[model samples]
Target chain A: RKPKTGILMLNMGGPETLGDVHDFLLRLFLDRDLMTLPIQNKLAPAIAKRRTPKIQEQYRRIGGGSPIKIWTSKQGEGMVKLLDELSPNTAPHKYYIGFRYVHPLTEEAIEEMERDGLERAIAFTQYPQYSCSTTGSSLNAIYRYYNQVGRKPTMKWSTIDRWPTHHLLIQCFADHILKELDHFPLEKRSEVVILFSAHSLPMSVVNRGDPYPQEVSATVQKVMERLEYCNPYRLVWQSKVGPMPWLGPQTDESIKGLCERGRKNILLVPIAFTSDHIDTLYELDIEYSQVLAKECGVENIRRAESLNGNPLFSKALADLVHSHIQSNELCSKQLTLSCPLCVNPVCRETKSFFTSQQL
Target chain B: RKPKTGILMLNMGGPETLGDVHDFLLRLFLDRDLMTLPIQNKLAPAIAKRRTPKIQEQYRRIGGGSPIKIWTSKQGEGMVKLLDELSPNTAPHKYYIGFRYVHPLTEEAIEEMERDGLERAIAFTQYPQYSCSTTGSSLNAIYRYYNQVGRKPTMKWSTIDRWPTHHLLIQCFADHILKELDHFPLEKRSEVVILFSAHSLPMSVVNRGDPYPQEVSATVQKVMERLEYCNPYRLVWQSKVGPMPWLGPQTDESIKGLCERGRKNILLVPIAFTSDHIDTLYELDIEYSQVLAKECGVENIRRAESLNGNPLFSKALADLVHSHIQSNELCSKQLTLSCPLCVNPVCRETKSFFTSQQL
Candidate 1:
């Protein structure tokens, strides 16, 4: 029997229903991949233990836990089932879950794929945008492993990589907007400013040629263009923190400008992500909503519902994988091993956890 | 006729709405205290530009901005009116509002007070728990300012300091719990374990005699004993980050333990703060709500409403002020500028940001 072609999906795991808050936050902050100490010391355990207490309490409030990890696993399970139904000959590879900063680290993921005795895999960061910090780093980790271990089994790796313009992705986002719009009076939909937002990064990266802002802009532009949305729209960013300067014209600033400019209704579309991480759940749903609608006197500020384990997303994912594998067979030289040999252009001196791989 | 006593209030600000997102976040992150960076540093500019755009987008969602600053100001204004009503002779010593992380800064407030010809004033921080990082740091900044200037004001000082056992403070907290209980199922009410969460600090601080954990325990003990809550109650901390290992039994762990121990319903009373900030809104409200009720299998997780600009809270503040003034005249001196020097030796230096101080 021919080996099954499997799809591996990755997403930031959330606390399953809220009680998992401490572990989730502990995992999030303590992961040296996202937050490393002055030295790459063994601080995660102690940090995790201490930090988990407060973060877990956060989950206790909402009905008590986040459905993030469960949701991510559910997404994988759903996609696997959907893929089998979509095509009979499809060899379903065992599912693998990878978190950039938490349990089942990247190396462990490669081990999981290897453990199953599979040589070929398709990878996609559940995030829609191709971020240097997130998707870029995750891919770098995989590439480093492949280059180091040397080519072994046949591996074909044709990836959608980024679907900034996937037709279905745009439709789902639009459908969410339309559904939320139903909650408001019908007369207001046409007047709603489709404010598009994405996560942010440090401004230095912008100066250094990181393409996050551009990618966000291009995606929003494409989504609006595809949907024929001429209703006044603006692009904004949220959750920028730390002492460093971040990229702007900021989201709040943009909101103020829009109100000052006399446009009232805003239909926000979080274009860069599909998962309901903390940024989307608390920051966008509660913090920003209060500010825009209450303080700025905006007529209505609504967010397109998050694409959390949505079936369409799963179907679109399956379609992407099938289409890619169908386009070409697995590469004869599968890249699975790691190389410390040092000549990769993006590779720089390794210090602590290497999160940024220069493209 | 002598000049009546005056009170000065301090608070943390937020992005008012979607319109203020960038400015609010930018200002917040760029603070030397929060981000541990100097604003003029090149790294500062780089970080500011990098993170702001996305943060703006996030603020667009939660309410299109943060209502923290506005809510705090309202809390201050109402407290002033309540104070005036409480003391008929005091002619409402003008209450001035200042933010710890943003404008108008504490030094600027001092300068304004100087300009106003009110040489004597009472100062109090809004937090209840005594974390050196928060209240300590804030008070340290003011004293440090005087140290830097090499001059002292002629006015004496009186302080309300920490009202850990104030009757009204406890009553107000209990009242909030009862209000949340109204919506919670009656059957679940008896079993509802009350969890009190204070913000966390690095364990290093606790090891260094910072006394943050002890203070948290003190408040927990007092509040619990006062209310006679014996069914099940625990005190944990929230928002502890990084590898520094902040102090905590942690909130999530306690919640899980309660759930595992067979407690079906849990209620949280935030004893540390007086106004609705992001910590309460995002972490306590949205984050914890999902964690307890949904994941831990707790039947109900009710978030005791934050001490909004409620009349009871206003009255409580006045009662504390009056009592403190009546008893010590010394604390009143520190609060009303009767004591020229800070009496609390612990306040001379900062332990953490959570307990930054004035009186």
Candidate 2:
């Protein structure tokens, strides 16, 4: 008989509608594991309320709400369908979306898995690179959910924490960049400067030795290598909020700098993200490409397509999950170790719990 | 004719004599690349002067001075001798020591290499795990030397920046642990808690996403795997100097914790460092083993010998270098990217300069 398995795809869920934006912001700010703020509990709601209107407007401009949940659902369904065909042993494969902030949160996902009587599951992070801020926070929330329930988890669990330079992933990224490059005039295609932009992390998080930047660079390098370094490119950071230096040169600044240097045509590749969200739709496309590029007098700026519902990405996810099942490993060697400077007891407990799960 | 290649071994060189101690500390504190201090130029000398006498005494107790220079020389000589036999194409390989805070500094090493008329060289970091404060600092000094000289480097260069989990290196570490474990009573040998202690990085540095802790953990993991998990082990940090937070649990505190848990049999492994110096000899042996262990009421604590003049380590170094020469790669892919939070222009210039060097 085929065994029942659940693939809990994890991500930071966004507000699907303007009404949910305040709660999303509140939850994001309240996550001390993700980012520490002074008097967070007391301040989070007030700040969230203040920022809600502005953020809602941005979402409205990008078609009235975030399409993340819709995209993630499609990707997850596609992956599990392929998984059932690929590995009949885990034949009745199902996927549960474990979003950190919005509805169908990690707790809800786990409950659904338990209700479905899944004896085995994989806590798979949608983040391609592991960051203490992203994957770490989501994984911590998994532990938190288990803790809150105050019971031993019945399902045998494993994780697909990171896959920065997976061959298929690199190929997908290269494919998108190539497609975007074709948009340029024939003569300008070769001259187009490829700017690989990832969401900026605060210096504080960065110094804590978050592996995001390094892993992001690895993805970029691998993609370029796949592209055979066909065009000149530079890795830049984007979507920096509230001061306190983030990794840079900022995407907007880089676009401006390239224009100043008279290198106009550019392709902005969001290498770190697996799907398009506010960061890509509004921040990269609306803010940088339209507003910033127009201000800088550069009209050739374009963004590579996100891997939201790409068939190749779906296959990549399934192949990655299948390989993970075959490897018979609980987690990556890296996932077992915490950042050297980590002081959060919750982070330690989370890693211990996940790594110790019997398969 | 066989190529006369120079293998420049880099390390944070310790003072060889009591008189050199003050200058060593002064140079260390003065180098903002390794660490930042407010009003560094004025404060460094004062701090060095105040601490020199105490540090000199520690060195005296260890054996009048640090044996780092002597061990490094022997290891380098042994590695080159084996390289000559194994890789005759890069034969007649000569070794040079580039110490960050002592005589035969980077400038001196580069000058010697130039004078020797070497056309090709490898900047081999002595530290197995890469730390921004260690390998990064040494590489930055290499760049600084060239910058100061106002001339392009004559020799084509490559770097063996890090090899934390190299098979032979892990084997050597495992062999040392096995040898150390034998000292325990036969009944307690299997139960002995192996404590892998690495030099602690400041929390600020760790937060910068330095790869040291991760790489060090990898070495420890590989060593344990090689040992077939014969004993329970934990990785700990040691040699913290400042009041500011650093990576912990500190070695001494870990010893105390283990004792409290009634796990008296402990084997201390210096997993990060390659050779015996003040850290391994005095800090681990005298300060922790003799003083702290007695305070903690543990009678069965032992320190593993450093890889000084270990034939396996020499072979490991030679094999690593030989492979590097064969690959014809200028540097590791990781070396080409700077830390995400890195603000140091020197670090950027250093990485650019090394990665761009022709093989």
Candidate 3:
């Protein structure tokens, strides 16, 4: 008989409604694992309250609320269904969505897995590249959940921590960019400079030896290779928040600069995140394509489709997880180590707890 | 007949004597390509004058001058000698050292190459990883030289721009680390933490999509893979100048942190540059290991041997250059591209000129 396996898909979940935006922001600010601020406990609530209205309006423009939850659920369901067909030893696989700072939280996911009596579980990060701020924080939350419950995990745990250069994932990105290229006139298609936009991490996080920047670049390189360098593309950054410096050649500025250089035809690809959210829906589409492109006199700006409900992405996830199960590895060797400058004791304990799980 | 090839090794040359430090600093600050300062013509001289004493003192401590010239000459000679044996089709290779800020500048090197009557030349960057500031600036100087001369270069040019993960290069680093690991007692060898240090790039350069950070990490990963990860290691940054938020988890702070964590047994590997300089000698050895480690109660901190005068490194260089000649490629595909956020017209022109070279 095949083992009952649970695949916990991890992400930083967003607000489902405008009313939940405040709490989502509050929780995000409160998580010291993500961002460290002075007097965070008190400051988080005040900042969240102040920013709620503007963010709510942004979400309102994007059709009521974030579609991340809906998309993630569908992707997860499709991935597990594929995994069941692909891996017979782990034939009956069920997926649980674990969000870091919103509904269906990591703790809730763990509780559901326990209730279902899963003996094998894969803590799979949805982020293709690993960052201390994102995947690290999410994994820490899993450990936090168990610690708060005052019990060790009963399931045999493993992780699909990162897969930045997975061939199928690269194929998905390449295919979408090729499809988007058709939006440009046939005469101008070859000249349309591809801009791969990923969420920017703070320089502080990057310098702390986060693997995200390099991994993201690897993804971009792989996708470009798949296209055989048919079009000149660049890996640009986007969605930088707060005043501190983040990774760049920011997407918007890049578009404007390209226009100034007389290379106006552009295709913006959100290559970092697997699903559509405010970053793609509003930031890339509404703000950049509509507002900034027009301001820059760029009439041919277009964004590549996000991997929401994309069958290829689901297949990629399934293949990745199936391979993880067959390999019998606890987690990536990288996951066993912490950042050299990592000061957080929680990171140490959390990484230790997860990697110590018996197969 | 074999081609009479000139290998023009590019680097940001340092002052050979304490007296030369001021002028080196002046030239570096004045170079709009390397750094753009406000009122640079006047302000560069002022800043150089002000900082001369401190910098001169640093050079004095590191043997009264930088040994980069000596090591580079030896490495170049040894590499060309090996090239004659290994690649006879590109035999009779001679090398010229081109420094950006000091003596034997790019103009002088090109003039020497012209005098030598070499019909083919290779612009070989000493930096194993590509950075917009380092390799990009150096390449721009070559273009500037030709523009100043009012004529195109006579010699056909090809480039060996970057070789961060070259197999022999990775072997050299891994072998050095393994040799360094022996310094620790047998019982503690497994527990000793390895810290791979590279010079920090400013966040601005990194955001401009410089490939250095990722390439440096690739070097570290490849080296670790060669070692089969016998010990824990983390890639850290060092030698951050001008406090404008450079890439980090700085070497010094990382040492202090490791000591605080009771991980006093440490092996520091200078993974980025090919030869020894103030960064490895004064910064890593004196400032970090001697001062910071002692302060942090770390008695067993040791630095790995640099690749200066290493026969293996010379071989790696030879193999890399020879392979480039055999492939008949103008440069790495990446060299044909500029940073996505690059605003420097020189970058575009220089890259275009080099990549356009015919075999």
Candidate 4:
């Protein structure tokens, strides 16, 4: 019989409303993985208090708060529809949204899955490209929960680490850019430059030999090949917060130079993003355009669409799940793939348990 | 006769090297006008230290430092050339770079002007649109320096404030946006939404009836009308720091909404800025572009060019200076236009001193 399975989608949560901005910051700053504070429990609240009002106003301006939860929910719904069509022979696939720093947290999602009597579960990350800061922190959160619950109901688990070069994702990006190019005149369209920009990661994290940059590059390579028209392109990093150096040839300098070199039109691809979020919505669309036109005198800059709630993107994840279930793989990489840098006992225990089962 | 004039061009300065980032933040956070800290003199140092490292890294990524000082110097050079041509009767306009923080500080600029034997001077703010936090702080710094010197050289100074809807300024922005629209096909150009974005200010400042928002809006209105073609447009705010409510329909939210409404092509105009700074180069260009692309699936968004080193924009200032020199106005408005909420004596002294001079 096709077994019933729980697809637990994971993501970083954001504030739902203006009021939630405070609580959201509280949770974000208090997370040890995100930031290490001195005497954290006591000092975190004070810091949160200091940052909240400004952050709250940011939320208020960006449509009175974040739509992350709403988009996450839509993605979950999209995945369910695809799963039903793809795996009709199997008992229905149930989907759950798990966030790291807010409501429907990993533990809460696990409890809900337990109540629904799910014994087979897949910890799937919604982030197409994974980083230790995101997927690693989330998977760790699940283990922290399991330690207290003692694996009751024996819900077996598997984690999906990264899928930077998913085929359908590349297709979605290629399609959007091709369409956006048509908006320019036929004569000017051929000369338009393609700029692939991604959110920058701190050097501290990259120094640990994280695979995110490599994976993102791979994704970019595939997408570039799939493009219908040949155009000069460059991949650049952006939205780097903090004093730490991040991956570079930053978007601003890249476009400015391109503009100076007589490139009038640019199609900027937010390569590492999977959904509509603050980084893409505010930072890329409004901020970067200002830079291209005002600073660089590049007036015709455009962004490629994200994969949020896109059917093909959802189908891609479903296809990934179907293959995983058939092969019964624990993660995307080799089952014996131990994250050498990861010292968490729970991360090791979960990965080892699933690997041992495969053995 | 046009007397020998000290055209003291004032602005908030930035780091020229990686090392200067630390000092820039120290001076920035130390100011009570910019930020309020508990035990400001004591806590401000800690806050500055905490933020410096990360800021230093931000500077590193954007070419290892800020070009604000360079750009300001260029603007100063451009103005000197323009002044010599426009006001042939005046002794050559001696330009001095006055910064609120870092090198070429207000006092330093005054000392340089004194060395040049300048008694008649114009404390011209580079910020065409005024803000209490910026112009107010800069003007107050001038007063502080004068008080320290105690009648030595007795510099007779007049400030230029709030040049909203300057004709040439409007023409420059209009021409750039119109030129930017050419990136799109002539057939589809009419439909592109013009997104006019400005840096946000705290409601605390606006509640006191600060003319910033109104003046910015006026500039936007004039520019929009001056455009050769009528395009749908919206004004929004961006890069709001700290935890306070600021002017809104934030650039993020406004663009997201436009994208949702199927507005594929957007022309973003950073209406209030004069040069390329962090707010324009990094924040507006990188951060806002990322947001629109990911959040709203909006493609074909472009920003109107900034008036950085543009001949018309520099000439506009020269024109404003000539008019101010002719009329000899102390500031932009009445002496009684004092901010009742402002407790800073330096702010009061400069305006009040001018008022007393009038009496």
Interface alpha-carbon RMSD, every candidate:
25.1, 8.5, 3.1, 25.0
Docking quality tier of model 3: acceptable
Model 3 per-residue lDDT tens digits across residues A1-359: 44499999999989989988998998899988888774437888899999999999999999889998999989998887898888877759988999987989999999989778787888999999888888889999988888899887888887888788788998999989989998788998877888888888787787666767767866776687689767766777888898977777788878887787777888999988988899999999998999888998995988899999889989999999988888887777667667766777898887777677543
Residue B295's lDDT in candidate 1: 81
Off by over 4 Å in 1: A1-359, B1-4, B17-49, B53-58, B147-151, B291-296, B327-359
**DockQ scores for all the models shown?**
0.01, 0.07, 0.36, 0.01
TM-score of 1: 0.44
lDDT of 2 by residue, B113-163 (tens): 988888697899999888888999999888888888888888898899988
Model 2 lDDT at residue B99: 93
- Per-candidate Cα lDDT values, in order, are 0.58, 0.83, 0.84, 0.70
Q: Which stretches of candidate 2 lie over 4 Å from their true place?
A: A1-3, A27-44, A110-122, A128-272, A283-306, A310-312, A319-359, B1-3, B29-45, B89-91, B107-273, B283-307, B319-359
Q: Once superposed on the true structure, which residue ranges of model 4 sit more than 4 Å away at CA?
A: A1-359, B1-3, B334-336
Candidate ranking under lDDT, highest first, comes to 3, 2, 4, 1
- lDDT of prediction 2: 0.83
Q: Is the docking of candidate 4 incorrect, acceptable, medium or high quality?
A: incorrect
- Top model by DockQ, which number? 3
Which ten contiguous residues of candidate 1 chain A have the minimum total lDDT?
Answer: A331-340
